[PDB]
Scaffold this active site. Structure first.
Site, PDB file in Angstrom:
ATOM      1  N   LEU A  31       0.849  -1.183   0.000  1.00 23.05           N
ATOM      2  CA  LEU A  31       0.000   0.000   0.000  1.00 23.05           C
ATOM      3  C   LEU A  31       0.887   1.237   0.000  1.00 23.05           C
ATOM      4  O   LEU A  31       1.578   1.520   0.983  1.00 23.05           O
ATOM      5  CB  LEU A  31      -0.918  -0.007   1.216  1.00 23.05           C
ATOM      6  CG  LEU A  31      -1.897  -1.181   1.238  1.00 23.05           C
ATOM      7  CD1 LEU A  31      -2.523  -1.316   2.607  1.00 23.05           C
ATOM      8  CD2 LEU A  31      -2.967  -1.006   0.168  1.00 23.05           C
ATOM      9  N   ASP A  32       0.869   1.969  -1.109  1.00 23.37           N
ATOM     10  CA  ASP A  32       1.865   3.004  -1.349  1.00 23.37           C
ATOM     11  C   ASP A  32       1.232   4.331  -1.767  1.00 23.37           C
ATOM     12  O   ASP A  32       0.888   4.532  -2.936  1.00 23.37           O
ATOM     13  CB  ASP A  32       2.842   2.514  -2.421  1.00 23.37           C
ATOM     14  CG  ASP A  32       4.112   3.337  -2.487  1.00 23.37           C
ATOM     15  OD1 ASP A  32       4.104   4.506  -2.055  1.00 23.37           O
ATOM     16  OD2 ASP A  32       5.126   2.807  -2.983  1.00 23.37           O
TER      17      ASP A  32
END
Ligand SMILES: CC(C)(C)NC(=O)[C@@H]1CN(Cc2cccnc2)CCN1C[C@@H](O)C[C@@H](Cc1ccccc1)C(=O)N[C@H]1c2ccccc2C[C@H]1O
EC number: 3.4.23.-
Lengths: 116, 116
Positions: A31-32
């Site tokens: 998750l970026d």
């Protein structure tokens, strides 16, 4: 869910990815929030799949090589969700097999960053 | 504050960085849950500051010339906040002068990723 941020523990998640070239597969993706666009591993694709060329900005500057765009949309399902994320296109990592949920996908599940 | 995730608009913040090698300066930094460690531009330092050489995995393959490590801890203050984030060490972009707030800093301000 609320996802804590820890330098020692990457915020990863199980994601079912449908590249529409083969059967949907489950991967572990980062998750970026710092990623403009989603990246999926080349391993998700078949051998005869056509991809567009591109040059993306990375830590080593421009990587004119191992990133490609899909021609077709990519569908992604999260564990707690029945309805899929549908990306018009997303990046494909051909060197390594990075799996990165970018803000393109995060917007669709209405994810936010919260600083108290 | 709640920061919406948007592929067209990066989640940035204005942060005062104290490198302890020169006067504290306010920069715009990318809020990045995909970064293990914080990156600050080399511009914030002085010309005589000693920095450690290292290797950091990035998008453009694998680089070991781009980033250096700080020798002294780095203090970062967010808007309307007096108590500083303290990082024992963080990356220094000696090329493109990137400013990235990683999960090391995000942990200390108790930042979280929320997916509805
Ligand atoms: C679409 C694409 C993903 C190509 N975009 C990016 O690479 C952006 C570019 N900006 C460019 C930019 C910079 C400044 C302002 N605007 C834009 C800087 C932020 N990155 C996203 C990075 O957060 C990507 C992650 C991916 C990764 C994680 C773990 C392992 C491998 C790859 C990343 O690069 N993280 C690494 C990383 C990154 C920084 C510092 C430390 C570390 C350690 C490591 O976790």
């Amino acid at each position: 869910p609320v996802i804590p941020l820890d330098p020692a523990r990457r915020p990863v998640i199980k994601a079912q990815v449908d590249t529409q070239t083969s059967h949907p597969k489950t991967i572990e993706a980062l998750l970026d929030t710092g990623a403009d666009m989603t990246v999926i591993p080349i391993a998700l694709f078949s051998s005869n799949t056509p991809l567009k060329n591109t040059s993306v900005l990375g830590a080593g500057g421009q990587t004119q090589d191992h990133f490609k765009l899909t021609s077709l949309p990519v569908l992604i399902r999260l564990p707690f969700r029945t309805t899929p994320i549908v990306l018009t296109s997303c990046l494909v990592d051909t060197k390594n097999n990075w799996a990165i949920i970018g803000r393109d996908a995060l917007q669709q599940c209405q994810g936010v960053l919260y600083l108290p």
